[PDB]
Symmetry: D2
Subunit: 182 residues, 4 copies
């Protein structure tokens, strides 16, 4: 019943989100995300949004399994799936004479999967530990395995395996998902 | 009775701390800080250390009054004082082709007065909100008023009023203290 | 006889060049650029290469008209078309904890059109004055109008009108060319 | 006859110059530098000024000996000395959220000793090759030996040996001079 697939989606654009359907195994087009149960997980740079809470009207949510290997996460939770909350999303980014200038909006996202952003905007505790050295970005994949309820309540087991493409283009996101589970 | 004074100390050096005596009203020389009751408060860049906890054998500690005006903090707390804990201290700093390279040591400091340092080393919640924009430092004095036990337990009311001198040299620290109180 | 067109080419990739044919009005595929007269002008980020000198075996070359408006450049030079010389080309670029790390090769390019690069790698005097502020890039289109000999000796009048696309993606290059002239 | 000495002067301040007398072997106080024969050489950060040309009314000037070892520069030139010209001098510097913000004035300086400054303000060809990597400063002492006429025309042989002090404070300048020669 459960099938495992890998998915790569280019979420490099700051202005928009890429919406994905677990059952379709494809990116889907979404013009009214807060009123649309056709998507299960959305990506924007290294942010992840689910169809629930502050992001939508579905049955979505996420829990961290405690595991960093997919095959070690064998008990599918029946409750405790945390719902999306409001947080800062970077919707414009441009380098110029004063460094990277950004614009932001408060929008819904999955703090469990994305991580929590600190005072300077760095997220940790989710799928990607993002920081800086003295003069630019550092990246560490956490390998955290999540259980993720889709808009219809069916669950995927999800692990994010890359944040860049094979040409090292950043914001191109790869994950494995096994779906539907228990 | 209580005397109020302003004090300015150059704590710009990364390698060392400046040690101060409330009763003497002077910087004192300290070679064994963990075993010396002759100092009450020590400064290093924007870090503050007290003679207690992980920093010394004295009766020191700090509590935030809840106020940002000296003349409004009239009741001297008997309770809620916090002793120094271990935290990251920047002991070397040098700009070069790869930005500011730093070295650190875990040492005792007053989290109440200094603030808590986050993942990238920015302190907030104490006397100085220190952050960065896209390409360098930002500063905001909190004006928080603290009650500060010295090495012998006698209390000063303390507020930090500047982080730079009149020529804008950073790491030159100015505070008002009223001592001894209640 | 002479036709005026605008052309936009995405030259954002550091590792390769985009080769253009004046007569075809199209990007052409070039696997042996030093031995191929099918291309007239090539772009790589803000660098421009012509089919001549250190870059190829054609009859190419460039001269600055002295003008910053196309319709003011009415006398087509019959000689003095400067041939490509060797210069530093950035063939890899990646941001990380130590800033932008780059790799370089010495290759042929048109110094007349590209400009001359200084000690830190900033080009000026050609189609784009590129510099930095204290913390990143600044750009100024020079509007210089060039006469540009193609591989077969036919001349285009060329003016570069943008260095970014309508979404502000850098390294997407737009120019007007009028061809063939006198 | 000729005496050789080493001199270290703190020229770290951006707003002012440090004025030196070859004969006195001391820093001198100068309030009207353009009309004062009591100074021979002045330092500001890595800039060097002589009492001649655009900098003063004296008989000063400089020539590069062609050597990088004091003991190899044995013949004292009679000819090829260059007087000070106008150039950009950084008179204010402050790090903030947008990087280092600077202010400038056009003033007299010795291009021979200082080097020529390029479009982004980096000097080379004089006593110190100053550049940047991706995210901050780089330094290389050239060891160039200069013959330097003082205000009265008497000549010193001069080589700059350091740009920082023994605690690595930048803008503290050390030079050897042999005076008066030939
Ligand atoms: C030398 C100066 C700097 C350089 C070259 C630099 C470079 C970069 C680059 C290339 C990115 C995109 C990374 C990615 O999305 O994969 C980025 C993002 C970011 N930078 Fe910097 N950075 C600099 C300074 C700073 C400073 C001082 C801070 C704050 C203390 C900062 C905070 C951030 C944050 C929070 C992001 C993520 C923005 C977002 O997408 O939400 N950066 N930086
Ligand atoms: C354009 C790049 C940068 C510039 C020009 C810059 C500049 C500075 C300056 C001038 C200071 C000294 C401030 C003071 O003590 O008053 C400083 C300190 C500091 N910077 Fe940066 N910075 C840059 C990038 C970064 C980044 C990307 C981070 C975060 C990863 C960072 C984190 C810090 C921290 C934590 C301190 C305080 C160090 C300490 O004393 O403990 N900086 N920076
Ligand atoms: C805060 C630190 C810095 C930031 C955020 C920054 C940002 C950037 C960006 C975004 C670009 C790409 C511009 C484009 O191709 O359209 C670039 C290119 C470049 N930067 Fe920087 N830069 C920084 C420091 C420096 C320094 C210190 C230098 C040298 C003094 C420098 C020299 C260059 C050069 C020469 C290029 C063109 C590279 C090439 O394509 O050949 N940068 N920089
Ligand atoms: C990460 C970004 C940068 C950092 C951390 C940085 C750091 C510094 C530091 C520490 C100094 C003082 C060096 C000394 O006098 O000994 C300096 C000076 C200087 N920087 Fe930068 N820099 C940065 C970006 C840039 C860029 C992009 C440029 C070019 C546009 C630049 C041009 C200069 C120049 C010309 C000076 C000498 C100023 C003078 O005294 O006349 N810097 N920089």
């Amino acid at each position: 019943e459960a099938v495992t697939k890998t998915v790569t989606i280019d979420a490099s654009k700051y202005e928009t989100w890429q919406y994905f359907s677990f059952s379709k195994g494809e990116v889907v087009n979404v013009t009214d995300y807060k009123n649309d149960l056709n998507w299960d997980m959305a990506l924007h740079r290294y942010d992840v949004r689910l169809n629930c809470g502050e992001s939508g009207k579905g049955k979505g949510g996420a829990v961290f399994s405690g595991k960093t290997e997919m095959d070690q996460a064998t008990t599918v939770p029946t409750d405790g799936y945390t719902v999306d909350v409001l947080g800062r999303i970077t919707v414009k980014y441009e380098m110029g004479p004063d460094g990277h200038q950004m614009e932001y909006e408060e929008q819904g996202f999955s703090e469990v999967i994305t991580g929590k952003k600190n005072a300077q905007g760095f997220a940790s505790g989710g799928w990607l530990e993002f920081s800086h050295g003295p003069a630019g970005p550092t990246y560490k994949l956490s390998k955290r395995v999540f259980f993720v309820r889709g808009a219809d309540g069916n669950i995927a087991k999800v692990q994010f395996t890359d944040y860049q493409d094979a040409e090292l283009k950043k914001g191109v996101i790869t994950f494995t998902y096994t779906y539907p589970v228990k």
